[PDB]
């Protein structure tokens, strides 16, 4: 973005110009999202029908 | 011993209070008992195990 100067004759020698100042926006990685489950071999053998569903 | 469904009686009379009982064998002895049975006395089986991931 720039500003301007308002002068009767338009000589700017006694003054200061626009600088050029960069800026930036940073994207980052977040935390993981994790759903975890565990079950005993016994449970799968006798309890676990339809585990898919 | 069942008055209403005598078709199931396994034994010859009621066991009332005060009936004398006893215990077969001697007091602290250790032994190896022999076993008679019919084929359909006791069953035996094994459950198939799924494989771990």
Task: Fill in the DSSP letter of residue B6.
Answer: G
For residues B10 and B2, give the distance between their C-alpha atoms in angstroms, rounded to a whole number: 9
Kindly state whether B50 is in contact with chain A, defined as any CB-CB distance less than 8 angstroms: yes
Kindly determine whether residue A45 and residue B47, on different chains, have CB atoms separated by under 8 Å.
Answer: yes
Helices (H), A1-53: 41-47
For residues B34 and B40, give the distance between their C-alpha atoms in angstroms, rounded to a whole number: 18
Dihedrals φ, ψ of B12, to 5°? -90, -15
Q: From the CB of residue A44, how many other CB atoms can be counted at a distance below 10 Å?
A: 15
State the residue for tokens 């250790």. Answer: B30
Kindly determine whether residue A45 and residue B50, on different chains, have CB atoms separated by under 8 Å.
Answer: yes
For residues A35 and A2, give the distance between their C-alpha atoms in angstroms, rounded to a whole number: 50
All residues of chain A having their beta carbon less than 8 Å from the beta carbon of residue B50 are 41, 44-45
Q: In B34-45, which positions are buried (b, 16+ CB within 10 angstroms) versus exposed (e)?
A: eeeeeeeeeeee
CB B35 within 8 A of CB B42: no
């Amino acid at each position: 973005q720039f500003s301007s100067l308002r002068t009767p004759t338009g000589d700017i020698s006694g003054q200061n110009k626009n600088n050029l100042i960069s800026g930036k926006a940073t994207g980052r990685v977040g935390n993981y999202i994790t759903v975890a489950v565990e079950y005993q071999q016994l449970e799968e053998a006798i309890k676990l029908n339809q585990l898919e569903e | 011993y069942d008055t209403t469904n005598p078709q199931y009686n396994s034994v010859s009379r009621q066991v009332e209070a005060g009936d004398a009982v006893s215990v077969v064998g001697t007091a602290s002895q250790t032994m190896k008992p022999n076993l008679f049975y019919n084929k359909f006395f006791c069953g035996l089986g094994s459950i198939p195990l799924p494989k771990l991931h």
